[model samples]
Every structure is written in C-alpha cells, then in structure tokens.
Target: LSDLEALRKKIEEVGMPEAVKTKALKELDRLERMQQGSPEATVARTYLDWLTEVPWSKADPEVLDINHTRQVLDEDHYGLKDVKERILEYLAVRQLTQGLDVRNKAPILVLVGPPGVGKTSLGRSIARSMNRKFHRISLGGVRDEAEIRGHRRTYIGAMPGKLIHAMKQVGVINPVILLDEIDKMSSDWRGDPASAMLEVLDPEQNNTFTDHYLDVPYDLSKVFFITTANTLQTIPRPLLDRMEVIEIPG
Candidate 1:
C-alpha cells in the first residue's frame, strides 16, 4: 500500500494532462488489486512508470532573441549564409508572435544537402540558440512502422516510439528533434514508416500525436522539428509538402 500511496501522490503532482493523469490513476488502482509478481502486474507497473516519467508539462524557457540566434548560428558554421538567414527569419517571426491570439505554428524545416555537409550540427546549433534540448532520430534504412509509432503493449518488451523516448530523454516538451536521413525511410509488409511520419511533421495535427504504446495524445506542437535529407527526389510529395525544404549546398 505504501508503493501505491507514493504513486498516487506522484500522479497528482506530476503535471501531466488531465486525461493522462486520470488514466494513470485508474491504472494504479488496478495495479493495487492485482496479485503481485504476476506478469500482468509487471506490465501495469511498467506502463505507470512510463506515464510518470513523461515530461508532459516541462519545457525549457525559449530564447527568441534574433541577435543571439544569429550569433549562435554564426559561431557553429562558417559560410551557410542562406541557411543562417532563413533560421534568423524564422526566429524573428516567432519572436514577433509571442502572445498573439493566433498560434505561431512551429516551422518544420527539412535541410537537403550532401552527406559531408554539417546539416546535423546546424540542427544542434539551432536548438542551442533557442535554449531547447536536441535529439536526433536517424531514420536510415528504418522500414518498420513500429519503429516510429511503437509496438502495441501486446507485443513482448513493447515501448514508446522514438519521439516519445526522445522526449523522455530530453525531459522537456519543447525540444529540437532532428529527423536524420528522412529520404532513407522505406516501407515493406510491416508498413510505411514515412506515411506514419506525416502526422508527426504536420503542425496542424501533431499537437495530438498518439503513440501506440502510450495510447494517449501527447502534444508535439511545442517541439521544434528539423529533418535532414540527402535529396528531395526520393521523398514522398505529401511528406515533402508538410515541410519547408531548405537546400544546403555542399
């Protein structure tokens, strides 16, 4: 009962969304009655552990100063003037729309360039400039949709998707996620991983991104997503349409 009581307090104080909090508490209630040492109890414990760990309401305070952003960008790379300028513009717009009624839709950027170019480092710099956490999910040769959406709990050793795990690792809601080698994603009988990415990259619908393992809506609207690609020719048009493609010459 002590464990249950401690968890109850945690659920109340964790600052997760109301729906998730309720769900977690309900799970705790079930766990309290289930016989200990059972496989079912272990699964419930794991689920509750994940629920408590998710940084639902945590975020780094944004640094929207355009000059600071520019300085950081300049300090990181030498001669990507066009890319730097575009990043500055995006930050300027975000700064201007701080508290307006209209939402400042987070820009989904796809930097297309050669392998040797500092595309990935540029993403890190952008995150540093804005005081946001940075995480890179390399999608190269990833064919299974479960890799992106996560396997269901029915599957053995199931866990949350890359995005959710990234959030947990960063311990913040607003992180800069670099989707590396987006063009490398391929589909097979397992399902199209790229198609699953559509919901993630889309600003309009991503606020309620539901990972299969979590089985709840996690707000990704605050996340600053940056994708890197070697070429646009292989990228699906629909997926390409959701992002602002910026070409980075090697």
Candidate 2:
C-alpha cells in the first residue's frame, strides 16, 4: 500500500480534482494488489501517467483578427467561396463575443458532399486561418464507443478517448480538431463512436467535457471542432443539429 499511498499523494500534488484524485487512488489500490510487470499493471501505470500529464487548464489564446483569418484561408485553397464565407462569419462571431461577456459556441463546421470537393483540405485552411495547432481524429471504420468516450480504468489498457488524446498530442487545450470521415463511423454492440461524439461536437456540453479515462471535466470551450462527412444520412439527428453543414458541390 506504500506505492498506492504515494500515487494518491502525487495525484493530489498535481491538483487535478477531487473526483480524479479519488479515481486514481482507487486504480492505484487495484494496481498494488496486482503482480508487478504484468500486462494489467503496466497498462494501469500508463493510464496514471496519462491522467497526470494532460494540461487540464492549458490552452493557447485565440487570434480573433478577421483580416488575418481571411487572408490565411484564401492563401491555402482557392475557390471555396461558401466555405470561406461561413468560416469568416464564425471568426466574426468570436471577435464579437470576446469582450461582451457573452458565450459564443466555437463553430462546429461539417463539410459534406462529393469525394474531392476539398473537404479534408478545408480543415487545414481553418488551422491556418486561426493560427492554431491542427489535430485530426480519423473516424473512418471506427466502431468502438471506447474509441470516443474511452475505457474505464477497471479494464486493462484503459486510456482517454481520441478527443482527449488529441489535446495531449497538440499539448494544448485549444486547437483545430478535425474529425475526419465522420460519416463512416459504424455502431455495433460494442458501442457507437458517433453517439459518443455528441458531447464533443455540442458546444453546450463540451465546455466541461468529461472523459471516461480521465474521469474529470476538461474545459473544451476554446477548441475549434470541424468535421467531414460524405453524406448527411449517416449523421444522427441530434448530432447533426449542433453543427453547421457546408455542402460542397462537385
């Protein structure tokens, strides 16, 4: 129990949260009883490290200059008129809300249409426009709920879902997160990755986003989430409602 107590102390030292520290203590207790160097122990140790390393409150400041944003979008890709207009409008809203004490939902742009209408490329343009780090979460062929919400620490190899992992990869809370091939997500008995995306895509709930693995609320209010899909038929109604659909014509 010495190692377990030390881990609990470490969790508290990080000032993570009461809930998270409690969960870490529980997981640590479990890890102590298990054989050392076993698969489960190794996995649990990794999970603990992940929880500790995430910058729960670290995020880069957003650039709200409309001219700069517009210029960057135009420089990268040509002739995305409607897409450009919507993006600019989103930036305009952010600029407007900055000093007003009003809450502005970060635009959730969903690019839909043909195979080559510059859908994936738009995400890059967005990153350039905002001058923010871009991280893509490829949802193609992903069917597991744990892939989105993540696995509980009770299970071996438990880790935060793709969304949380992306923040860790970029090392910032605010970044341009492109959810690629959102239409291809499939649901089965394991779980629906798309369904888990509701909290992620929804601006209302994402402010205090909770990951199953982290088991703590991480503020995602500053994240700019963008998605790409081939068709609207596959997107669930609730999830579809939260996003602004930009139909790119071939």
Candidate 3:
C-alpha cells in the first residue's frame, strides 16, 4: 500500500492537482484499512469507492419548456395526433404545476399497442423529456415470482430482480422503467410474478419495494413506470386494478 501511494504521489507530482492527489491518497489509505478484515466488506468498500469517484451529476440537463416540448413531440413522430395531443395535455398540466421544473415532476406516459408498434419509442421520448435514463424489461413469459422479487441472498444463485438491476444499470434512483408485455405475464409456481407486479405497480407499496436479493426496502418513489399489454384480458383482475387502463384501441 505504501509503495502504491508512493507511485501515486510521483504520478501526481508530474502534473496532477495537489488537492486531488491528497484526496486520492486519503481514500486509498481508508480503503486499504477497510480491506484488512472481512473480504466481502472489502469488495463492497471497493464498489462504494468507485461509486463516489464517478461524476454522478454530469448528465446534460434539459430545459423542460412547454413550447419546446410541444415542438419535440410534434417533430419527433408522425401520424400520432391523439398521442401528440395527450402530450400537449400532459405538458399543460405539468407547466401549471411545475413551470420550469417540469423535468423533475412530470408524470410518465405508457404507450400500449400491438406487437411491432413503437411502444418503446414513446418510452424513450418520455425519458428524453425528463433528462433521465431509460431502462426496459420484458415480462412476456415470466411466471416465476423469484424473477421479479428475486431469490433471497440465502438462496442459491441469489440475485436482484429485473427492477433493481435496471436501476443499478441506469445508476439513478429516478428513471423510466418500461415493463413490456405486461398483460401477458402468467404464474403457476410457488407464487406469481404477476401478483408481485401488483405490489410494484401500486403507488403505495412500490415506494418501498423490497427485493428478496436486496433484503432491504428501496424507495422507488421517483421511478416512472410504464407497462404495455397485448391483451388486458390475460391480466389478473386484482393486478389490473392497480393500473389505470388506457387501451390505445389499435
């Protein structure tokens, strides 16, 4: 560790900023000491260090101008006037509620259509409007509850489900999460992935979604969730009760 610090110091002396060099050395010392005991904690510490090292606040901020939003919606697509009108209405409501701060408060829109349509494209546009990352997961044939809630860490081959994984991959707490083919999800195992989705889609419970892998509640309050369905008939009634169904009538 001392040799590593010496090399870092030398490299810093060549052209690096003195303050950054000091910080780097300080963090390295802390990490080395952190690694002295438990190997798992040490690995976790390494990850924590990397997380703080990145420029988390470096993404380009969008000015959510209602006029500009209308233009973007109008120019970005063709023959979707009803869709564009809905966008306008959404912008009007947001502008009334947030004005310049629409980026943070505007609700997400879900485009439900038959297969081969641009449901995903609409999700991207919503993300672009909000200046947030877009993550999508397919729920086409997932029936196992573990796939969504994930297996508990004590279980063999444990892992966080698609939801947490998407959040981690996007590296943000708030973003667009599009669950594709949602209505088609089936269940017959120990429990139902579809039923778990009821908890996720619920504005009440989803705010503290507890992945079996995470074993702790993650506040998913900031996530904008959109679900697509080929047919609403397949969805369990109780699960359907959570989402406001706006069939596109395609």
Candidate 4:
C-alpha cells in the first residue's frame, strides 16, 4: 500500500499531460485491487513506472537567433554553403512565426550525400545552433515495423518503439532526431518500417503520433527531424514527398 501511495504521489507531482495522467490514475485504481504478487500487477507496475518516467513537459529553450545559429553552423562544418543557408532560412521563418495563431509544422529535412560528407555532424550542429538535445536513430537494415511503431500491450515484455524510447532517454519533448541512413530501410513480411516512419515524419499527422505500447497521442511537432540518405533511389516516393531534400557533396 505504501508503494502504491508513492506511485500515486509521483504521478500527481510529475508534469504529465491530462490524458496521460487520467490513464495513469485509472491504471493505479486497477492495480490497487489486484493481488499484490500477481503477474498482472507487475505489468501494471511497469507501465505506471514508464508513464511517470517519460518527460511530459520538459523542453529546451530554442535559440532562434539567426546570426548565432549561423555562426554555430559555420564553426562546425566548412563550406556547405547551400546546406547552412537552408537551415538558416528555416530558422528565419521559424523566428518570424513565433507566437502566431497559425502553427507551422516543422520541416522534415533529408540530407542526401555520400557516406563521408559530414551529414550526421551537420544534424548535430543544427541541434547545437538551436540549443536542443540531439539523438540519432540508425535506420540501416531496420525491417521490423514494431521497431518503429512498438509492440502492442498484449505481447509479453512489450515496450514502446525506438522513438518513444529515444524521448525517454533524451528527457525532453523537443529534440533534434537524426534518422540516419533513411534509404537503407527495407520492407519484409514483418511489416514496412518505412510506412511506420511516414506518420512520424508527416507534420500534419505527427502532432498526435500514437505508439501501440504507450497507446497515447504524443505531440512530436516540436521535434526537429533530420534524415540522412546516401542516395534517393532507394527511398519510397511517398516517404520522400514528406521531406525537403538538400544535397551535400563531399
């Protein structure tokens, strides 16, 4: 009972959104009545633990100063003039639209370049410019859809997808997520991971992105997503359509 009380106190004190909080409380109510040593109770306990652990309201303040961002980009990488300019332009627009009634969806940037062209580091630079946390999810040879969408709660040892797990690790709602090697993902009998990525990259749909394990709509609009590809030939047309392609040469 004391354990349950501690969980309840944590749930209330944490800055989780209202819907998530409601769900956590309801699950707690169920856990309260269940046999303390049962398997179901353990699962419920794990779920509650994750619910409380996920960062709900924490965010890094964006450094939207264009000149400062430009300096940061220039300091990190040499002579990717077009690429740096594009990022600055995007930031300029973002700065212009701050605190407006119309919410602009975040631009999904795809950096197409050869393996040694600093594509990954450019993403890190972008995060540094904006003062946001950075995380890289390597998409090379990722065939399982569950890897991106997560396994349903019915499966034993089920867990949230990589995206959610990344969020938990970063401990912030908005981060610069570098989806590395986007062209390397392949579809198999398990499911098309590319299709699962569609929702994640789509600005219109991603604000309420839902993971099967979490089963709650998590807002991903604030996240600055940058994808890297060796070549455009392997990327799906629909998937490619959702992003702004920028070429970076070695």
Candidate 5:
C-alpha cells in the first residue's frame, strides 16, 4: 500500500541499525501483499511505527560539574550523605574520562531498606540531580526470561523486553531506570529472570545488551540503573555483584 511506502521512507531516514531496518522493510513488504485497511495490515503498520519511534540515537549530554551536581542533590532530597557522595564520585570520574571509558559501566545502585523509607523517591532525586528522566521497572515475582529479554517477534504475542521497552518509553539512550523489588523475583524452568538480569547488569556485557524481540545489540552502558529491594537475602549472589549497595535506614 502507499501508506506502507510512506512509513518505509520514514524508517529509512533514521539511523536505525541494519538488523532492525531490514526487519521493518520485510514487514512493509508483507504488508503490501495484504489488503488495504485489513486487520493484519493495521497490526503490521503499528509494529513498524514502533521501530521508528525508538530513540536509537537520542542521549542527553551528561552534566558532570560536581559542585552543581551536589547542589542539585541537596536541594531535591535530604539526609543520604554517603549515597550522595558515591554518586558524585561516579559523576566526577565520568567527567574526567569524558565518558569514553566503558569500564565505568553506569554503577547499578541498589537501595536496600524496609518499607516507608522513601527508597523510590531517593532514586528519583538522584535522577533529578543528574538532570535525567526517570523510569521504574518492577521485577517482583516475574518468572519468565521473556519478561526481561523479551519474546521473539516470530511469536504470536511478541514484545520488546521490559528494559528495551523502558528505553523506548523514555526516548533517550540514557535515563535513570529504577528496578523495583529485585529481591522479590522468583525462578522456574523457563529460566530464572535473575539469571537473565546478568547480561543487563554486567558492565562488560551490557554495552551490547540484545533483546530477543529487538534482535539487535543495544548500548545500555549509558543508562543509569538503580535497583531497590526490601531485603538482599533473596537476590542471586551473582546478580548482586553488579550492584553498589546503599543501605537506606528507616
């Protein structure tokens, strides 16, 4: 259909990777074969639109001035001196390195605490301090590997994984992503979602995080990931290694 061609041209203008671009082109081709205004055509067109809207190249430049950073932290939230210092240190290093070092894989901040202590708000304050948008992802009781990495497009209900969806939702390469209830995750034969988090959490590997649905490597290195849990006892030992634990006292 002519509409399909119009969407295809839009996709071509973006710097989307060859993998995603080819998928869009293939889907458009299939849509052309279908009848205009058909249900299947409508679905196909909707999927293609999602591919173009993702912020594949959008990232707000990092503001790394330590004094201003500290000021923002103090103004927005109160009484987390150690947490503020640690975050400032990381920002300082990022400034020194000019953000070139992948070794600095954005530290995954895990705020450990009991309920009613403002853990979620604390994470939000950090995002505001960094002048970034915030998005929260709930990992509680999620048992499917597909939840984290996503279902492949060949499947009937294919969807981008939570992390990928978060990136697209925020429309930026870097955002303060809060993973809530890390310790509440459970495991089963489909595979432990905790294990799936390994790749997303690993600085060394996460630079190339590949969502099953996306089928292309996405750089999550710039994403400021913060996780929260009521307790640390239930989190997988290996998964905990990737995070910097900050105990928030009630």
Candidate 6:
C-alpha cells in the first residue's frame, strides 16, 4: 500500500511540458514578489499564469481546392442539391473576387432552412472544407444584451463579450462563425444582441467593433459570418437585411 501510494504521488507531481513549467514558474515568481502579503494572491497568481500561458495566435486556415467541397458535402449530408450548388457558386465567386476586393474580407453566408434540415451540419461541413476553425454561437433564449456585447463597468458581472471570447478560443481572426437560433433571438428595451451583431457584421463598423468589456475595438471585419434561421420571415426585418437569406423549403 505504501509503495502504491508513492507511485500515485509520483504521477500526481509529474512535471508539465518543459516550456509550460518554465512559463508558469516565471509568472509565479513575479507574482510572489509583487503580491507578497496579499490574501487573494493565489487567485491573482493563477490568473497571471493563465493569461500568459495560452498560445494566443496561430497560422491562417489552409486554402482548400474548391472542387473537393462537393465530395465533402455529399459525405456529410444526404440531400440539398440546390444548397450544394449555391455553395459552389459562392466558391466560384470567391475565387473570382480574390483580386477584385468586391466586398468585405470574408463573404458571409446565411442559410434559411426548416428545422432538422441540416443547417448546422452544413455549417460544420463548410468549415471542414475550407480548413478553417468552426465556431457556433447559439442565440437561443438569449435576451440579455450584456451576454453578447459584454456589459458596462457599472454592471457587476461585466466581462469581455461572446465575440472576443470566441475569437480568442478559436485562436484565429478569420473563422467561419455561425449564429444558431438567430430567428428566435429576443430583445429588451435596454439593448439587443442582434443589434450588436449587426455592428460586428457590417463591413464598415465591424472593422472596429468595440465591446464594453474589452473597452477597445477588435476587428470582426474579416470574420465569415453565417446565420441559420428556421424561416426568413421569422427573423427580424432589419436583421434579415444585414444577411443574404437562402431559403430551404420542405
């Protein structure tokens, strides 16, 4: 039993990757000196380690052959020829416009389809096809403005918002971002997440979208925004205008 206990302890104290250990130790030593007598110093110390710890950036998404997209669509989905064709058309347009600079850095694709009609799956497939990271933010039952855009300093729980957080997590500036359950988004008199999204999606304003928590503008101009809705009519008129609605009727 004693030998077993010793083995377990050895496993528990196993060193992290040399680089990670070095970084954590350096941060810890720095905090130890600055916060010597602080009661909540451990929490601050932990946060500091986490802040400098993560790889904050990475290489861009790999460019994929537009033709290979057809194979991916067939494998991931059972039907929707029109949808597949439309996507191919989009690829062609993207290829053509690479030099023209027609619109925003990334062209947003919005899919309007019936419930259980593989809208989200299409989102996943596109990301895989493009070799870009996939991130879906479901706006279902979200009524609070603070949730999407972050809250003001006056708000007790204010923090960096969904957009900035998602960008950080995906570790890329340009990603295929899908807004799920967007038709069912709610709004109070105070503010609306959809409105905030508009600002982020707009090529002009989104180039510098300011989140209340971040207190600085982060460029969402290049984000490829995609929105999936049950029906275009169910979506707010103003919001609908911001996106190109592709209807999928069953």
lDDT of 1 at 134: 92
| Per-residue accuracy of model 1 over 66-120 as CA lDDT, tens digit each | 8888889888899878878877876676678655222325546789989878899
Ranking under TM-score, best-scoring first? Answer: 1, 4, 5, 2, 6, 3
The residue-level lDDT of candidate 4 at 170 comes to: 92
Model 1, residue 249: distance off in Å is 2.2
Better of 2 and 6 by lDDT: 2
Q: How does model 1 score by TM-score? A: 0.92
lDDT of 3 by residue, 12-69 (tens): 4433334545555665656666646576545444433332332223233544566666
Return the TM-score for each candidate structure: 0.92, 0.80, 0.68, 0.90, 0.86, 0.73
- Which residue pairs clash in candidate 4? none
Candidate 6 least-lDDT 10 residues: 48-57
Candidate 5 structure quality by residue, lDDT tens digits, 8-41 = 7878786787887887788888988999788777
Candidate number that wins on lDDT, 4 or 5: 4
Candidate no. 4 TM-score: 0.90
Model 4 lDDT on a 0 to 1 scale: 0.83
Which has the better TM-score: candidate 1, or candidate 4? 1
Tell me which of candidates 3 and 5 scores higher on lDDT.
5
Q: Could you give candidate 4's per-residue lDDT for residues 88-112 as a string of tens digits?
A: 8866876786542223344467999
Model 1: pairs clashing at backbone N, Cα or C within 3 Å: none
- Give candidate 2 regions above 4 Å deviation: 1-15, 18-41, 98-107, 187-194
Q: Give the runs in model 3 whose Cα sits over 4 Å from its true position.
A: 1-66, 90-110
* Local lDDT at 236 for model 6: 64
- How displaced is residue 72 in candidate 1, in Å? 1.0
